[PDB]
Specification:
The structure is cut from a larger assembly and holds 3 copies of chain A, 1 copy of chain B (about 120 residues) and 1 copy of chain C (about 110 residues). Chain A is mainly β. Chain A contains 4 helices and 26 strands. With about 120 residues, chain B is an all-beta fold. In chain C, about 0% of the residues lie in helices and about 30% in strands. Chain C has a 4-stranded antiparallel beta sheet with strand order 3-2-6-7, with no helix packed on it. Chain C is globular. The interface between A and E is small, with 5 and 7 residues. The complex binds 2-acetamido-2-deoxy-beta-D-glucopyranose (NAG) (14 copies). One 2-acetamido-2-deoxy-beta-D-glucopyranose (NAG) binds next to loops of chain A. Chain E: This is Spike protein S1. It is classed as structural protein.
């Protein structure tokens, strides 16, 4: 007997435990939206005495917690199921409520819903249903168990008219199962009256899984009041069983001087509610106010890159054996190609990536104008010298790295790559020099150092020592003097026609629509239209005086376009006295109705309220 | 996920040339070169040759200068061996391997050996 | 050029005994030149050791290597006789020439 | 030193209506105003110097 | 252990990233490449544990 009715005002609860008085504190949390569909689900298993195959007990998703209200006599509804598929592939829970006990536990049972539903199990003949669980019939690795006191206080309201209105709110944000609840029998029989009542907390404990679906435990050996039907499409049918789905909303909440919640408003229902939320009060005087600011959102995305094809020789530069010395390195330039950065870090994790400006994961999307590659082998200890502003024996006379270096430096061990019993005398480094090296140039020079006041003419005697020192590697010594093959990738982001991009698909060119565009790395959103500009053959980008791009030539079509921002403006609410009327009149600042406010579409208008037919 | 396959056995008379196709798939045929090597019973292998991807640069040994000229087709993704001036008893198995010892553009040698080999063509 | 010289003439050992292999060169081979292969009968070569002690195709517990400069040695412990492949060694720094080789028999 | 909350002031009796699960009293300053004694369950008051 | 301690395990292959303080203990083969093995544990189907 599924049915659909209105929820009205229901679901307010204390979000914390601190005491407050005469405060208008506002919060942003999971709540039950005002005036929402509340649907009576109905697990239907009772008819005479026979089996009555029913295919009922539908899987109810546990979406952002659930609001559960009930008027249950004693124990017909007992417990609940949370988990995924309840088998030996995903962890499962067990939450069963005794008379006064709780037996929550964790297990991976494949099947547990076999309580041997009897033919004579109808309560009209006998209501005896004890230990009708037959749960965790299988347990491969089930260890996490738990016991505690009952959550619901099983109290009888001594009559059916003033039945015990039982309310729970279930949420599992970062573990710590919340069971905020409240009992109230004041209702005289009707469903969901008008009023206010906050809900107190009970307990919270952490377990941790992707809990996905929900279903209450019924007394499978004692059932009644569930007739068979297929009611739907906003109808009415007795079920004695409720459900409600929460959403993350912002609420304004008032506290009585005793400390009890008295009233609350949801900021995202009515322009009047928005006005009441913006200024902290429940009465708004006649006038005009500002509430929010709407803006149209993009509908899709497009990427257009040149038609370049060719794999950059990153394999050639990385894999080699005849790298030269530190003082005399080698420089290489990357030509027009597309570069696959996946093999750099996703494979062969030898040493740290040591990124400085760009992150390795954020690669393969941005595009570059040129790439430099340098290779040398150094001290294992001198690795830290390769960093901006860092000084050392080689950081001043062998290799200087600029302050604002961008890109990454790649190094890996070379114990096998370079080890001679007699030592390696083919590796050199400059030791003495007149001045500190400016970044990125060579100081190679065949000359004898002149120290003191001895003008050596090639004597190379006292106070005249060779600046280049034969490094002399070792095959058996420990780390540090062990060889480290070092390569450095130097990028630059210069506003020029891009040369080397990542691997991306070039989609079609849409126009006259609010879309997201990426023209060789110019991220942004707007409406691409025709342009009448007179771009010269070497011109690439247009510009207004803001350092803001407003004209882009198509890369693979050689056609210029115009870029315009999305429709944008503020929102105003015109209302009379709040004690005179409740109607309003929304003003959309500086926009034409024909552009977009003539109708609201799904997720295309920041103001949530759309109570107008527009 | 290397895929290297070779054609069947071939017999050619002296004075002609032997053309054998080595098909490569599953890996990009530009990161590493392909080395062709020869094996005969009772003895090890040699430095028959190594072939690059984009151009004709090679690392031919000092034994067979003037004859060793193979080709590669990146469109066909096939290494073609076209050994000319056949010798009387050149009958031996040929292995095309994804080499890890020679570099393509600037000619600098690599590190290691021959990781993945071919299935072998017997002539 | 330089041709390798091998004198592990016969590995006449039963499974379970230690096996040692040597690949002494002529005059010098630098440590950045090493390759080792198993030549199974009627099969294709495959790389096992491309350096000092690294792994190419699995190598759970058997293929080990060490050495420095003029000496290089390969060690096998607890050998399982399914392979009985030829131990081939190769240097790279001085041109390229495969080693003599060493057949591995069963010793029934 | 009421389970932390180090500070100075004057302690006296209160008239608050702390519910059983209530523990802290606050004003609109993110500052404590009332506190319940852990060892007695008594509603005290905090007044600065 | 002289023969090497092997009783201590760790996962290698798994579908996505891990939430803080969460466990994904399971006994299954991994689906890698393009071969969905149903227990063969062959190539491109590696044992994550
Ligand atoms: C950083 C660096 O060494 N820059 C050199 C400079 O010292 C030298 O004077 C000039 C030619 O005289 O060439 C350049
Ligand atoms: C910079 C320079 O001159 N480098 C070398 C030099 O060391 C060598 O002596 C010469 C011939 O051996 O070839 C050249
Ligand atoms: C460039 C580079 O990292 N080369 C090394 C190589 O020297 C070493 O022999 C091999 C281990 O098999 O690992 C790799
Ligand atoms: C509740 O659901 C019915 C159909 O199930 C729908 O017609 C009605 O508009 C819904 N109520 C609200 C407030 O959207
Ligand atoms: C109910 O079950 C009994 C026992 O199996 C059977 O005899 C009877 O026919 C069933 N009822 C109907 C309507 O079939
Ligand atoms: C369930 O409750 C009954 C009485 O309320 C009690 O006798 C029984 O021991 C409880 N179950 C467990 C497992 O403790
Ligand atoms: C009711 O249940 C009892 C067992 O509790 C059984 O003996 C009896 O036959 C059933 N029917 C009636 C009408 O009592
Ligand atoms: C789980 O139970 C199974 C039962 O077959 C057992 O083999 C296994 O060792 C247990 N532990 C784990 C981590 O799977
Ligand atoms: C939980 O959700 C699904 C279960 O349907 C699962 O595939 C997914 O990997 C899980 N995600 C997280 C974050 O736990
Ligand atoms: C709030 O407190 C006042 C005085 O302390 C009392 O008169 C009033 O009844 C209280 N409100 C309640 C208990 O709802
Ligand atoms: C590059 O690709 C685009 C795809 O639209 C095509 O129009 C263009 O003609 C191609 N290159 C040339 C010849 O400009
Ligand atoms: C609004 O007007 C009514 C008279 O109809 C009055 O009782 C009420 O107090 C007024 N509202 C306020 C906030 O004073
Ligand atoms: C708004 O749209 C109407 C519809 O045609 C148009 O006539 C009017 O000029 C537009 N407003 C402005 C400022 O252009
Ligand atoms: C704490 O200990 C004192 C002294 O033993 C005792 O009087 C007091 O009752 C205890 N607190 C509680 C909450 O029982």
């Amino acid at each position: 007997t599924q049915s659909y009715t209105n929820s009205f005002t229901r679901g307010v609860y204390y979000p914390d435990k601190v005491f407050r008085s005469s405060v208008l504190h506002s919060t942003q949390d999971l709540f039950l939206p005002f005036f929402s569909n509340v649907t009576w689900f109905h697990a239907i298993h009772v008819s005479g005495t026979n089996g009555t195959k029913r295919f009922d007990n539908p899987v109810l998703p546990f979406n952002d917690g659930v609001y559960f209200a009930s008027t249950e006599k004693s124990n017909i509804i007992r417990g609940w199921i949370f988990g995924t598929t309840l088998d030996s592939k995903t962890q499962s829970l067990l939450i069963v409520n005794n008379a006064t006990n709780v037996v929550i536990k964790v297990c991976e049972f494949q099947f547990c819903n076999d309580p041997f539903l009897d033919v004579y199990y109808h309560e009209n003949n006998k209501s005896r249903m004890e230990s009708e669980l037959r749960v965790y019939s299988s347990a491969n690795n089930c260890t996490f168990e738990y016991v505690s006191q009952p959550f619901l206080m099983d109290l009888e309201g001594k009559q059916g008219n003033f039945k015990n209105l039982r309310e729970f709110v279930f949420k599992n944000i970062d573990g710590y199962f919340k069971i905020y609840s409240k009992h109230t029998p004041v209702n005289l029989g009707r469903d969901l009256p008008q009023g206010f009542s906050a809900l107190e907390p009970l307990v919270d404990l952490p377990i941790g899984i992707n809990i996905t679906r929900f279903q209450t435990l019924l007394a499978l050996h004692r059932s009644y009041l569930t007739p068979g039907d297929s009611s739907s499409s906003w109808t009415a049918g007795a079920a004695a069983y409720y459900v409600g789905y929460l959403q993350p909303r912002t609420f304004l909440l008032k506290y009585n001087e005793n400390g009890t919640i008295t009233d609350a408003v949801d900021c995202a229902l009515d322009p009047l509610s928005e006005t009441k939320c913006t200024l902290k009060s429940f009465t708004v005087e006649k006038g005009i106010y500002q509430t929010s600011n709407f803006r149209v959102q993009p509908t899709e995305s497009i990427v257009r890159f040149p038609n370049i094809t060719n794999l950059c020789p990153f394999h050639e530069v990385f894999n080699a054996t005849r790298f030269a010395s530190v003082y005399a390195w080698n420089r290489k330039r990357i030509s027009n190609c597309v570069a696959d950065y996946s093999v750099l870090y996703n494979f062969a994790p030898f040493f740290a990536f040591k990124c400085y400006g760009v992150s390795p994961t954020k690669l393969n999307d941005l595009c570059f104008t040129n790439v430099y590659a340098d290779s040398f082998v150094i001290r294992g200890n001198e690795v830290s010298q390769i960093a901006p502003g860092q000084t050392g024996n080689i950081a001043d006379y062998n290799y200087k790295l600029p302050d604002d270096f961008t890109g990454c430096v790649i190094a890996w061990n070379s114990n096998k790559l370079d080890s001679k019993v007699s030592g390696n005398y083919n590796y050199l480094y400059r030791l003495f020099r007149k001045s500190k090296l400016k970044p990125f140039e060579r100081d190679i020079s065949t000359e004898i150092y002149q120290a003191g006041n001895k003008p050596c003419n090639g004597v190379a005697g006292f106070n005249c020592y060779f600046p280049l020192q034969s490094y002399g590697f070792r095959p058996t010594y420990g780390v540090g003097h062990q060889p480290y093959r070092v390569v450095v990738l130097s990028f630059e982001l210069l506003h020029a026609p891009a040369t080397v991009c990542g691997p991306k698909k070039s989609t079609n060119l849409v126009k006259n629509k609010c879309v997201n565009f990426n023209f060789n790395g110019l991220t942004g959103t707007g409406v691409l239209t025709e342009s009448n500009k007179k771009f010269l053959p070497f011109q690439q980008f247009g510009r207004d005086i803001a350092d803001t791009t407003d004209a882009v030539r198509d890369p693979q079509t050689l056609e210029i376009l115009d870029i315009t921002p999305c429709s944008f403006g503020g929102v105003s609410v015109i209302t009379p006295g709040t004690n005179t009327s409740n109607q309003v009149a929304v003003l959309y600042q500086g926009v034409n109705c024909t552009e977009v406010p003539v109708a609201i579409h799904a997720d295309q208008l920041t103001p949530t309220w759309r109570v107008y037919s527009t | 996920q290397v895929q290297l396959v070779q054609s069947g056995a071939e017999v050619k008379k002296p004075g002609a040339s032997v053309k054998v196709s080595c098909k490569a798939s599953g890996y990009p045929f530009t990161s590493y070169g392909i080395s062709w090597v020869r094996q005969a019973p009772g003895q090890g292998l040699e430095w028959m040759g190594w072939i690059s991807t984009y151009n004709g640069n090679t690392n031919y040994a000092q034994k067979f200068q003037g004859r060793v000229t193979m080709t590669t087709d990146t469109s066909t993704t096939t290494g073609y061996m076209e050994l000319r001036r056949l010798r009387s008893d050149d009958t031996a198995v040929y292995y095309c391997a994804r080499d890890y010892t020679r570099g393509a553009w600037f000619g600098e040698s690599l590190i290691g050996g021959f990781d993945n080999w071919g299935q072998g063509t017997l002539v | 050029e330089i041709v390798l010289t091998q004198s592990p003439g016969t590995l006449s050992l039963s499974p379970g005994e230690r096996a040692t292999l040597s690949c002494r060169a002529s005059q010098t081979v630098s440590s950045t030149s090493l390759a080792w292969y198993q030549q199974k009968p009627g099969q294709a070569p495959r790389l096992l050791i491309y350096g000092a002690s690294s792994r190419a195709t699995g190598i759970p517990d058997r293929f080990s290597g060490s050495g420095s400069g003029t000496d290089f040695t390969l060690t096998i412990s607890r050998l399982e006789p399914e392979d009985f492949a030829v131990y081939y060694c190769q240097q790279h720094d001085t041109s390229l020439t495969f080693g003599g080789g060493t057949k591995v028999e069963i010793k029934r």
